[PDB]
Paper text:
These proteins commonly contain low complexity (LC) domains that can drive the full-length proteins to undergo liquid–liquid phase separation (LLPS) via weak multivalent interactions. Our work bridges the liquid phase and solid phase of hnRNPA1 and illuminates the functional role of reversible amyloids in the assembly of stress granules and the pathological risk as intermediates en route to irreversible fibrils.
The result showed that segment 209GFGGNDNFG217 (named hnRAC1), but not the others, formed hydrogel at 4 °C. The hydrogel was composed of amyloid fibrils observed by TEM. As temperature increased to 25 °C, the fibrils disassociated spontaneously, resembling the behavior of full-length hnRNPA1. To reveal the structural basis underlying the reversible amyloid formation of hnRAC1, we determined the atomic structure of hnRAC1 in the fibrillar form to the resolution of 1.0 Å by micro-electron diffraction (micro-ED) and to 1.4 Å by micro-focus X-ray diffraction. HnRAC1 formed needle-like crystals that diffracted both electron and X-ray beams well. Moreover, the hnRAC1 structure exhibits a distinct feature of negatively charged D214 continuously stacking along the parallel in-register β-sheets. Stacking-D engenders instability to the fibril architecture due to electrostatic repulsion and hence is barely seen in pathological fibrils. Note that in the local chemical environment of the hnRAC1 crystal, D214 is in contact with the amino terminus of hnRAC1. In contrast, as we mutated D214 to V or N, although the resulted peptides still formed amyloid fibrils with no profound structural change, unlike the WT fibril, the mutant fibrils were stable and did not dissociate as temperature increased. Similarly, in the hnRAC1 structure, kink at G211 enables the aromatic ring of F210 to reach out and interact with the Phe residues from neighboring molecules via π–π stacking.
Residue numbers in the entry: 209 to 217
Write the structure that this text describes.
């Protein structure tokens, strides 16, 4: 998310 992480695996 905004201010954080977005992980696609």
């Amino acid at each position: 998310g905004f201010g954080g992480n977005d992980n696609f695996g």
